[PDB]
Amino acid sequence: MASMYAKHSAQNYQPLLPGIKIKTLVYGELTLMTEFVMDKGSSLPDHTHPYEQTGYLVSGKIILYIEDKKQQIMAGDSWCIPKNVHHHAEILENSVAVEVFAPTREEYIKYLDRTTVV
Amino acid sequence: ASMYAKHSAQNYQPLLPGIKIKTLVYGELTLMTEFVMDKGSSLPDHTHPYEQTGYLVSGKIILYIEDKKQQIMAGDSWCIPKNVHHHAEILENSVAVEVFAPTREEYIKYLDRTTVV
Numbered sequence: 001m002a003s004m005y006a007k008h009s010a011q012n013y014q015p016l017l018p019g020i021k022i023k024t025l026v027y028g029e030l031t032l033m034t035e036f037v038m039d040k041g042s043s044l045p046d047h048t049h050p051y052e053q054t055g056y057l058v059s060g061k062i063i064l065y066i067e068d069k070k071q072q073i074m075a076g077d078s079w080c081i082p083k084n085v086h087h088h089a090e091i092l093e094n095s096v097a098v099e100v101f102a103p104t105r106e107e108y109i110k111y112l113d114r115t116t117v118v
Numbered sequence: 119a120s121m122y123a124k125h126s127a128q129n130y131q132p133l134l135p136g137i138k139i140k141t142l143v144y145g146e147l148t149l150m151t152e153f154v155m156d157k158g159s160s161l162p163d164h165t166h167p168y169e170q171t172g173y174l175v176s177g178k179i180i181l182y183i184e185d186k187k188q189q190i191m192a193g194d195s196w197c198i199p200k201n202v203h204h205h206a207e208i209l210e211n212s213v214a215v216e217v218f219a220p221t222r223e224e225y226i227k228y229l230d231r232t233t234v235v
């Protein structure tokens with residue numbers, strides 16, 4: 001089936017934005033999971049995508065903006081951004097986040113680190 | 119329909135012996151849950167009509183999907199398609215974040231509303 005495992009790795013993070021590196025961990029028929037490695041002082045500009053985006057902060061500290069809201073996000077915090085909802089972020093510290101997209105975000109399939117897929 | 123959620127060390131609700139659960143956030147297509155799992159516990163074999171993609175925040179487990187068996191450490195990830203048999207053995211005090219698609223309605227009742235903004 002669409003079953004897959006993936007092992008953690010410290011390499012193969014593809015650049016996306018200045019200070020923002022991305023890697024697709026796993027994906028299936030309905031979801032796609034990425035891991036965002038973001039550097040202190042960097043920033044995600046405002047963008048909208050036709051994919052629901054639900055996330056979890058593994059480490060670090062960021063400021064997550066959604067619509068009019070502005071919230072400081074630290075390790076263990078989570079968020080769910082519906083499709084086409086404006087969102088951006090300021091990266092205050094070296095942070096890592098796990099973000100799952102739905103439906104399967106076809107564009108990010110190519111970022112999969114196939115060296116770690118079991 | 120957007121929402122943030124802050125981390126809180128409580129309101130992790132009973133699910134199974136040694137398995138506590140908390141729904142962090144949920145949307146129109148996804149639902150995120152966090153499983154706190156005690157060393158030596160086990161999830162029994164089950165199937166649900168929801169795709170289950172997960173990330174191991176900490177610990178060490180043994181995840182079974184169909185014939186496959188893999189030892190899962192922190193930073194590892196998996197994806198279990200809908201109605202696929204799966205279970206796990208817990209080797210250490212572990213934490214996993216799991217997202218379900220479509221939004222798993224019967225898990226909305228585990229949402230820790232005290233930390234949702």
Ligand SMILES: [Cu+2]
Binds near residue numbers: 047
């Ligand atoms: Cu985005």
Ligand SMILES: [Cu+2]
Binds near residue numbers: 164166170204
């Ligand atoms: Cu399950």
